């Protein structure tokens, strides 16, 4: 019938900076001689490469870049044993996002960056620009923004909870008409949780 689905991974990661490149690797155990990468979004496209075979694994590295807005969107990979093409089942989708296209937001901690254990921490991501939503990442949550606030800011609050254990957080802003196009990253925020004396 139809061959199994390949695996689709992005190196170094899912979020790509503007004018940089990302390697979307597509690999499978089936001896696929051809790999096809398809993007759904503003500018749909299908790229073809031939697959190398090493240690019983067929694979092909797709080089997406230098990153533009037209290259952002949902990607799926297909494998094929024959040409002139019997495509396999599509891979799991990957949402490739371009970042750094708008002013960076501000990321703050309430009540503070360092709290005692059990005390609550809420990360507020704000900006004078009318971003429609904000994305919080700890080294991925999306929350819609609220209307004009203090200083005309658009803002979103991410409650971390009682037992967050902290970490380093970054925030991105985005508009709802272009889901895969994000702003410059906010400055990193170290959230530390020390024990109660």
């Amino acid at each position: 019938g139809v061959h199994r689905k390949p695996s689709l991974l992005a190196h170094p990661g899912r979020l790509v900076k503007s004018e940089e490149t990302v390697i979307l690797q597509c690999w499978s155990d089936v001896r696929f001689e051809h790999f096809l990468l398809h993007r759904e979004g503003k500018f749909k496209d299908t790229l073809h490469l031939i697959g190398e075979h090493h240690d019983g694994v067929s694979k092909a590295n797709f080089s997406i870049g230098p990153m533009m807005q037209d290259l952002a969107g949902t990607y799926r990979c297909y494998g094929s044993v024959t040409h002139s093409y019997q495509l396999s089942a599509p891979s799991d989708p990957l949402d490739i996002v371009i970042t750094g296209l708008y002013e960076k937001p501000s990321l703050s901690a309430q009540p503070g960056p360092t709290v005692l254990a059990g005390e609550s921490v809420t990360l507020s991501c704000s900006s004078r620009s009318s971003y429609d939503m904000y994305h919080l990442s700890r080294e991925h949550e999306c929350r819609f923004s609220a209307g004009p606030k203090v200083n005309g800011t658009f803002q979103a609050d991410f409650p971390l909870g009682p037992a967050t254990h902290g970490g380093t957080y970054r925030c991105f802003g985005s508009f709802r008409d272009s889901p895969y196009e994000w702003s410059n990253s906010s400055d990193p925020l170290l959230v530390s949780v020390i024990g109660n004396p």
Partner: antibody
Amino acid sequence: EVQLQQSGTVLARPGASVKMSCKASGYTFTSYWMHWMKQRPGQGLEWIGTIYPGNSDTNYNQKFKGKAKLTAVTSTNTAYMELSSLTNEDSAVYYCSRPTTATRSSAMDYWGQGTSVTVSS
Amino acid sequence: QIVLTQSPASMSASLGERVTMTCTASSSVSSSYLYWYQQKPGSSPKLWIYSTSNLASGVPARFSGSGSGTSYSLTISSMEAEDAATYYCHQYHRSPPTFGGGTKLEIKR
């Protein structure tokens, strides 16, 4: 209340450049986005791009990526659009518009009167 | 690249007639971000219907809007002489925002 005054009719030669203005009054110029549309005679409207005057951040239609340049001057509450490498196909009436809310996707509520540019030798 | 096709491109109605016009999108459009504009020759387009159904300020109740997914419509219950104009639909569901080819409404005699 809210009014958008665009620059007057302009004649430009092929291969040159033209710059048109869109002056805002009746609202905080910095709090809202500004859109620019192209309408050739007897056709629908094309979206060129958008600019947020507070940041001067931009987002262009891929079709007009190299054609148009969007700038803004906050001291004068004025947006500008500069068209380069002019063709006869660039002859049209160009509009500026402000959406209902600060969200750049909300309905284009307020509209400037449009600038007619004629490109001919 | 959400293409909006308006049908019919041109139509004519008598005074007091019921008018209807359609806007078809190549992809699904969220109903909150489909808008209708009315334009008369020489003047700028005017917001007529926002978010599929809601009438803008200063738009008579004889106008109405409806639709979802890929098909949307604008309807006039009884035609008036002032209604004769070109109507455009516009999606801002996905950038680039796109406008339809327009439907020209004229007075039949």
